[PDB]
């Protein structure tokens, strides 16, 4: 960790909390992933059907959801690790 | 009964189950955020050398909760599939 | 609505406010959509031209704008609906 | 003032001006709806104080503040798309 | 002219200097993002084992670039101080 | 690093790149911080003045700016570190 600027040492309490966040994060993210795959297969069956547009939009929205979830976990983990804030 | 909300389409049992599964997992993570928040706040309240760090962590958990709610809203929207005019 | 966890019944007042917010959101959204179609048509004509990358960048930025707008509306609608906030 | 003084800025055109101002016109329209709802919740909270719905009103105010921020970001990105500044990265 | 844009206000020498200071520093970081992106891209283009990893980092650097431009826009907005109707 | 779920070991190339990102981030963040302090003092001199509202708004905007910058950095750093991505 010392090689990385602003990083501080781990502690047992921090490791547990960070892994608890990540575990719950992954649980939700895998739900997003399963829904994504479902939408993908449905879109793949007929790209010119009425619902194709709707399926494509749902894929984009689930990609947004995954991005937001990773940001939420990174902010939460940052709060726990309590890194040196220069600004 | 006719749909009262602009762009809303009807529910289906499959959509309800999926949306409630998203929200269930969302709240589970959100309650972890809430617990860490209360812990930090309590520390701050009883604080010392780390007061600044505690307040920054509180601000960052507030952001985390906001991002999580946005994650859930986008995913439930994707399942609901309301009319997307743009 | 009661089938969705955290949801509350609709009221005439909430329906009017929510609809008003969406109405305005769609208006702006349609402006974004028209500008998007313009750049798309420009790319159709331009192809390999000097401004192709600029049109593609504006397309990406309008996609971002659309995303932002939807998030604004969602947050506003949430404020009006007032669901149970568990965290 | 001169846009040329700002790094990456390019000259305006009638077309861009019209489009940019159309975005901002529609943006402010929605923002004023947010502001009206915000003021309504603010007054309700002023009146409510210790009442049971106080937490709901305060959360609604926080969420409308987020909504306003997102709308300005949406406008900014759309306007940037029309202006088409130099994009170094 | 700035007056043609709704809500815009006149520049000042101080504002110009601060806005360009933000944009300058923004670009330095952005170019670092761009260099890393091109490196990942060349790696993918000429490749294998970590293809998925390279593609993922390209997506994450695209996000990073977007966040940076938003950071700059907000900072620049703060300096310019346009009319804020809401 | 191996105690944190999803983390992979560091390498010298990674360390250098991540710290280069962080250095450039802080440089911009300190500019944001300097502007924030300037606006704060201006607001503190006359909180009932006509421009107090504008200064206050500028402070909120800078705060948002700082938050975006840290997110930019975290995403870039994540890209370089290349942790295990389960979803
Ligand atoms: N004080 C302190 N803070 C830390 C430490 N490790 C991370 N942090 C902070 O938490 C942020 C989020 O970590 P994350 O696990 O949720 O996302 C991390 C993680 O996904 C990835 N990352 C960090 N170290 C990694 C590593 N060894 N291996 C693989 N991936 C790694 O890059 C993300 C962003 O790193 P960052 O430095 O820019 O922001 C950290 C950083 O500010 C740490 O050891 N000490
Ligand atoms: N086709 C369809 N789409 C729906 C329906 N209900 C919601 N949606 C969509 O999913 C979005 C996210 O829902 P959320 O539950 O994750 O966050 C919702 C939810 O938290 C809250 N909300 C909506 N209806 C509510 C209600 N009755 N009661 C309490 N809160 C409510 O407001 C949020 C945003 O509403 P929104 O309309 O702008 O976007 C919806 C909306 O576009 C629906 O019934 N049918
Ligand atoms: N080629 C080009 N691109 C422009 C020009 N003006 C703006 N842009 C781009 O559009 C972005 C968003 O514009 P906005 O009106 O929606 O937000 C603006 C606006 O709210 C404020 N701003 C810009 N010029 C201003 C000005 N004279 N006076 C008051 N406020 C001003 O700051 C934001 C712009 O910050 P930015 O420079 O980082 O991003 C611009 C910038 O990238 C321009 O004249 N030429
Ligand atoms: Ca009162
Ligand atoms: Ca009063
Ligand atoms: Ca009283
Ligand atoms: Ca000054």
Numbering used by the authors:
A (entry chain F), C (entry chain B), F (entry chain C): 2 to 88
B (entry chain D), E (entry chain E): 1 to 47, 50 to 88
D (entry chain A): 0 to 88
Quoted passage from the original study:
To further investigate this interaction, we determined the crystal structure of Vs.4 bound to cGAMP at a resolution of 2.0 Å. This structure revealed that Vs.4 formed a hexameric complex that bound to three cGAMP molecules. Analytical ultracentrifugation confirmed that Vs.4 formed a hexamer in solution. Within the hexamer, each cGAMP binding site is composed of two Vs.4 monomers, which make extensive π–π interactions between the purine bases of cGAMP and Y8/F82 of Vs.4. Extensive hydrogen bonds and salt bridges were observed between cGAMP and Y8, H11, K23 and R79 of Vs.4. Isothermal calorimetry (ITC) experiments showed that purified Vs.4 protein bound to cGAMP with a Kd of approximately 30 nM. To validate the experimental structure and to test the hypothesis that Vs.4 could bind cGAMP and sequester it from the effector protein CapV, we used an in vitro CapV activity assay, which showed that recombinant Vs.4 inhibited cGAMP-mediated activation of CapV. Importantly, we found that Vs.4 mutants harbouring mutations to either the cGAMP binding interface (Y8 and F82) or the hexamerization interfaces (L29, A66, A73 and A77) failed to inhibit CapV. Of the Vs.4 mutations identified from our forward genetic screen, A77I (which sterically clashes with the hexamerization interface), T12I (which removes a stabilizing helix cap) and S74N (which interferes with interactions with cGAMP) mutations were found to disrupt the ability of Vs.4 to inhibit CapV. We also found that mutations to the hexamerization interfaces (L29, A66, A73 and A77) abrogated cGAMP binding.
In bacteria, cyclic dinucleotide (CDN)-based anti-phage signalling systems (CBASS) have been discovered. These systems are composed of cGAS-like enzymes and various effector proteins that kill bacteria on phage infection, thereby stopping phage spread. Using a genetic screen, we found that the phage protein Vs.4 antagonized cGAS signalling by binding tightly to cGAMP (dissociation constant of approximately 30 nM) and sequestering it. Vs.4 binds to cGAMP with a high affinity, thus sequestering cGAMP from its effector CapV, thereby enabling T4 phage to infect bacteria that do not produce enough cGAMP.
